[PDB]
Design a protein around this ligand. Structure first.
Ligand SMILES: NCCCC[C@H](N)C(=O)NS(=O)(=O)OC[C@H]1O[C@@H](n2cnc3c(N)ncnc32)[C@H](O)[C@@H]1O
Ligand SMILES: NCCCC[C@H](N)C(=O)NS(=O)(=O)OC[C@H]1O[C@@H](n2cnc3c(N)ncnc32)[C@H](O)[C@@H]1O
Ligand SMILES: Nc1ncnc2c1ncn2[C@@H]1O[C@H](COP(=O)(O)OP(=O)(O)OP(=O)(O)O)[C@@H](O)[C@H]1O
Ligand SMILES: Nc1ncnc2c1ncn2[C@@H]1O[C@H](COP(=O)(O)OP(=O)(O)OP(=O)(O)O)[C@@H](O)[C@H]1O
Lengths: 489, 489
């Protein structure tokens, strides 16, 4: 079976040895003057009669992907960064002996450099008549084809062969710096806040712990910059944002990765209603720049980011997707506990009325939110950093928004109430001691920072990785992350 | 003494309570239509005769910094994001009672919003004739002045008061996205590689360790993306870069921070000589855009980034700054060990000839490199990822470059030699077991990735934080990092 593959490994190493007993092995002096796209966008419209008479020399380098050897001439496909180009490897277009003694002896996946002139084949294809041809790196292993997880264990392979996957990560990088251009253009300053916090705060999840060996001190890997960005606002950086990693112990998932990219952005003298008018206007502007169209296919669905997003209260969503729901039960703890238990929810000792009304929303409405939707009016019990609402103080001015069943973003009117912020970190701590290992920590510092005066403000957080998925039609986070986290072996 | 300061804390809280028994406390509905800079760049050239007759209403919000109360009118300095502006708080320009019952009762540091029309005072200063005036957040603590380290423990204060410090962090953000515009313009793709590696590699330093609670797995906080960026090159991302954090256990320093920002950039089919022609051309382009001039003051020195950097071999630097040095001693281990011991160096059991020749360079020449300098020809023993040199294999094609006594950057021709890369990870491991806890780990994966073929390449790393220091004349890393790491209490 596949021991003529171990014939390949062996044979390549013996080749590499003899190159080494010459000096040829691993040279770095070759210089190319074009990539593959730059020849195609400059010369595809030209036919042979033009290209033969134009007589353009070019130098290129890449990974040899095919080789038909027709005798005294061959045909080599060279793949580099911008695609693939065609080589015409003639015996007597090369210097005496390169064709028979070097070119024939090279394997696929090897790195070659080529110099020659452009033309068009019988096909009409753009090809390089090679006149110098060089080996640049000996590939000791041959190109693959397997496992569906090789693409994550060895992403270098998936980038070489799959082009969906390659153009996905080129769209990712366009997206990231398209978000920035939009965020600056609005007047925001990209800051860098610490990824090693000593008290982790700003979201509700289990952090990674590490020990600083020079200060006897245990640090945490931040679960959000939220507490620290809000410090900068008090400082008078009144339009800050930060697109960077964060770290949560959540398991390896298809909506989760223990390290993931998130933007957070805070805007002074503005309320959450202004964060909607930017979430909407962002996703429209990203859809237009990345895709040329407000309308975006994703899975079996199509989303229209030109069209305004749907918007419901949390209670509206429940009574919409569970219409038999006696809405009075969201008002009394025992009735809410019973209601939650009846639809499957296991209500914990550490749950109060708003958490039950939330965990019931989570059951009943969430995955049904498929067109982009905002869900406003979150309970206070679950939103320890959001402002309280003016007409009803047991609910915050906080929206989460959803596209296709997942939470993308989370924003709210911010809590510029020092004292109330302290007492809500108390409830979180009372909550951890009741058995909630995702409760917050009391950040005695952040509470001080508020006492110095935090201007009324509203802030937003948006999972970039989830959003990268929407614009590349990828359905696992492990497909928009270059090196996604592995369950090992 | 300072118990009329605890009179201030008490008095502010009692104020905030009575606002709360009204509803006024923490409103968020105020909207401003200008910041302070936008009034100054639009109306400073105008005199009163123009501004009185133009009659421009404006709304602004900020932190009240001063208040002269002259009786039936006052003068208030309002500081917001873009600077400070002047308010003319008249009694009868405000709605009945705001002046006597609200405006007088507000403290400094409070967040007010103001609406009014522009004019010029007797001074000729640009001021707002207030006609609506509102309290937006009650500051429970008053503005400071202390300790020289408060600026790092509570950076929100240092941004409010010190303006050197504020404009330093605004220059930082201009620098970061000026590097990107220059890096893209050259044709590089900003990627995101994992900050949680399972085998940390790519530099020589002690990493942070953490445990992933869902996979029984111990992760490390990456000390560089170097191993992973080079994977992406093999994939055919032949121009990648990444400006992001990394993490080392190094102590809290003035050239170090346990988390710090670094760019790394890899370029296919190019050698380290091409990384110089970009280090030079970067620092020139950054000096020109950030400062308007190729010449940069820093400390007692002045650097000229228009002028080409000085360049020495490692041995040239030694024999220049220790001219009596018998250069034959850099060739024999025992003579090099004796030479090192004589200038103070304590040579370890795990040191070979090149490490001694390096640690001797480190003693003898390094801090004398003040004008921007390149130091080429590093020994192999200390450069496990660099390519070997063609004429002498015991030295790599690796330069480190220095400005003003510190190492800024580190680049080299990259090692596209699979087998040699494996045997050099062996020496590193033999080295850890000899007593070097900054030796590398054998990354059995990275070795495979090379076997698939790494095109000849050259890569560079540049400490951004150190470089931010050069362009803001700041001399501690703790002054270009928003929240620098604290020795606690
Ligand atoms: N001041 C407004 C709130 C700002 C952000 C807030 N502090 C926060 O972190 N909210 S969140 O709901 O925890 O996260 C925002 C987004 O992060 C994304 N996220 C969270 N955990 C992960 C994981 N594990 N992988 C990928 N993406 C993730 C997801 O899209 C969330 O909607
Ligand atoms: N392939 C070329 C090499 C690329 C970079 C290489 N892997 C590397 O990390 N080299 S380095 O010398 O370790 O770091 C580059 C710069 O990082 C900076 N650095 C390193 N540690 C710290 C700390 N602790 N604080 C601040 N800046 C730091 C410093 O400017 C170094 O010159
Ligand atoms: N205490 C909890 N009990 C049950 N499920 C929970 C709890 N906390 C979080 N989850 C669930 O964990 C999953 C992770 O979902 P997701 O990351 O999209 O957002 P989330 O509900 O806001 O959580 P987080 O606070 O981790 O961001 C969700 O299905 C979420 O409801
Ligand atoms: N094994 C060692 N023995 C003595 N000093 C060392 C050793 N390793 C690093 N140092 C010193 O630690 C300090 C940290 O310096 P710096 O961060 O500027 O660059 P470096 O010498 O290349 O180290 P690193 O590998 O940590 O980046 C330097 O003064 C450096 O020489």
């Amino acid at each position: 079976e596949a021991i003529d593959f171990n014939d390949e490994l062996r044979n390549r190493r013996e080749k590499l040895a003899a190159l080494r007993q010459q000096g040829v092995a691993f040279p770095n002096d070759f210089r190319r003057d074009h990539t593959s796209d730059q020849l195609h966008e400059e010369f595809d419209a030209k036919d042979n009669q033009e290209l033969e008479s134009l007589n353009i020399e070019v130098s290129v380098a890449g990974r040899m992907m095919t080789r038909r050897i027709m005798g005294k001439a061959s045909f080599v496909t060279l793949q580099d960064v911008g695609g693939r180009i065609q080589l015409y490897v003639a015996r007597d277009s090369l210097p005496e002996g390169v064709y028979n003694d070097q070119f024939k002896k090279w394997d696929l996946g090897d790195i070659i450099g080529a110099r020659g002139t452009l033309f068009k084949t019988q096909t009409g294809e753009l090809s390089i008549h090679c006149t110098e041809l060089r080996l640049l790196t000996k590939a000791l292993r041959p190109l693959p084809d397997q496992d569906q997880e090789v693409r994550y264990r060895q992403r270098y392979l998936d980038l070489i062969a799959n082009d969906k996957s390659r153009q996905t990560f080129v769209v990712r990088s366009k997206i990231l710096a398209a978000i920035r251009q939009f965020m600056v253009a609005r007047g925001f300053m990209e800051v860098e806040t610490p990824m090693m916090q000593v008290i982790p705060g700003g979201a509700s999840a289990r952090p990674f712990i590490t020990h600083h060996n020079a200060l006897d001190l245990d640090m945490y890997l931040r679960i959000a910059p939220e507490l620290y960005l809000k410090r900068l606002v008090v400082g008078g950086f009144e339009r800050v944002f930060e697109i960077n990693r964060n770290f949560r112990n959540e398991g390896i998932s298809v909506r989760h990765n223990p390290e993931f990219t998130m933007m957070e952005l805070y805007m002074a003298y503005a309320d959450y209603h202004d964060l909607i008018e930017l979430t909407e206007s962002l996703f429209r502007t990203l859809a237009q720049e990345v895709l040329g169209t407000t309308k975006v296919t994703y899975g079996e669905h199509v989303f229209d980011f030109g069209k305004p997003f749907e918007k419901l209260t949390m209670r509206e969503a429940i009574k919409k997707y569970r219409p038999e729901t006696d809405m009075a039960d969201l008002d009394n703890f025992d009735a809410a506990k019973a209601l939650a238990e009846s639809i499957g929810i296991t209500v914990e000792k550490s749950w109060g009325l708003g958490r039950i009304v939330t965990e019931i929303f989570d059951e009943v409405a969430e995955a049904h939110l498929i067109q982009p939707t905002f869900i406003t009016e979150y309970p206070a019990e679950v939103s320890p950093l959001a402002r309280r609402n003016d007409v009803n103080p047991e609910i915050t001015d906080r929206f989460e928004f959803f596209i296709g069943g997942r939470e993308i973003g989370n924003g709210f009117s911010e809590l510029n109430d020092a004292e109330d912020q302290a007492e809500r970190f108390q409830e979180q701590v009372n909550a951890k001691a009741a058995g909630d290992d995702e409760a917050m920590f009391y950040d005695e510092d952040y509470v001080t920072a508020l006492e110095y005066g935090l201007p009324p403000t509203a802030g937003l957080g948006i999972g970039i990785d989830r959003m990268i998925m929407l614009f590349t039609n990828s359905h696992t986070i492990r497909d928009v992350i270059l090196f996604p986290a592995m369950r090992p072996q």
